[PDB]
Amino acid sequence: KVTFKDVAGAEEAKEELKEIVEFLKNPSRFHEMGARIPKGVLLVGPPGVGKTHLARAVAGEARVPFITASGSDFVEMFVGVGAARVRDLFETAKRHAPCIVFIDEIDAVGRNDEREQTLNQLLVEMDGFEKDTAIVVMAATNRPDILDPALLRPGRFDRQIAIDAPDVKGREQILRIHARGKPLAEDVDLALLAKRTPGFVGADLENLLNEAALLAAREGRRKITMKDLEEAAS
Ligand SMILES: Nc1ncnc2c1ncn2[C@@H]1O[C@H](COP(=O)(O)OP(=O)(O)O)[C@@H](O)[C@H]1O
Numbered sequence: 403k404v405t406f407k408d409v410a411g412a413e414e415a416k417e418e419l420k421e422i423v424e425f426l427k428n429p430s431r432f433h434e435m436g437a438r439i440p441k442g443v444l445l446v447g448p449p450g451v452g453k454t455h456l457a458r459a460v461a462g463e464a465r466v467p468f469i470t471a472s473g474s475d476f477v478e479m480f481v482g483v484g485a486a487r488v489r490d491l492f493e494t495a496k497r498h499a500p501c502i503v504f505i506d507e508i509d510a511v512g513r514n515d516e517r518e519q520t521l522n523q524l525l526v527e528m529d530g531f532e533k534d535t536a537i538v539v540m541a542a543t544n545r546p547d548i549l550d551p552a553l554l555r556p557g558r559f560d561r562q563i564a565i566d567a568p569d570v571k572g573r574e575q576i577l578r579i580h581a582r583g584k585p586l587a588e589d590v591d592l593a594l595l596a597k598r599t600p601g602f603v604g605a606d607l608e609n610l611l612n613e614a615a616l617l618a619a620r621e622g623r624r625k626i627t628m629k630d631l632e633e634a635a636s
Pocket residue numbers: 408409410411447448449450451452453454455456542568571572575576579604
């Protein structure tokens with residue numbers, strides 16, 4: 403249900419992700435034209451910036467499935483098991499093509515037996531892509547420093563899109579979500595909180611709200627005021 407409309411900002415990202423969108427909607431068109439798409443896009447940027455959200459939106463913008471997983475979980479699994487699932491991930495994916503496959507914390511694999519077996523499996527799976535393969539693999543990373551070099555070779559994640567901290571609207575949206583469940587006072591202006599927290603990321607905001615919630619309860623107050631919010635921040 404997420405489209406590029408539900409994504410605040412990310413001008414270039416969406417621009418660069420159009421070719422992908424178009425392709426997923428009518429892959430047969432691109433097949434007939436003899437055109438080849440990258441099919442391996444890595445979103446690079448800090449945590450709580452909207453990478454999973456943008457990816458999901460890319461699958462929605464093309465009204466196609468969005469199959470996810472986490473390079474982190476794969477590594478958490480017993481050796482052999484992780485690679486077994488990487489296998490299951492792409493198998494299921496081909497079953498439901500076109501669509502998007504989203505591997506999160508891909509540096510879990512890129513950056514130990516488990517980690518190696520999962521990496522090789524992923525690589526073989528991605529190298530097994532034929533032209534007629536209508537799957538676009540999107541991965542996410544915030545630690546590009548540790549990402550394994552092989553993942554970035556042409557044919558794999560040979561395309562990257564940097565993603566920065568959310569804009570004023572994107573900040574307001576996160577605050578609004580996380581504000582859900584909290585007794586805000588009348589003076590609370592979430593739009594304003596959004597305006598005066600430039601640079602903040604998902605965590606900075608999710609936390610600020612919580613800390614603002616503690617000063618409230620810790621002082622016995624039954625409602626978080628704009629003050630608490632402003633204080634919680636510093
Ligand atoms: N532009 C935006 N519009 C709406 N929500 C956003 C936006 N940017 C971030 N968010 C919120 O912040 C959370 C951050 O997680 P995610 O989008 O997966 O990115 P990341 O991989 O950087 O953590 C999302 O679940 C979403 O609810």
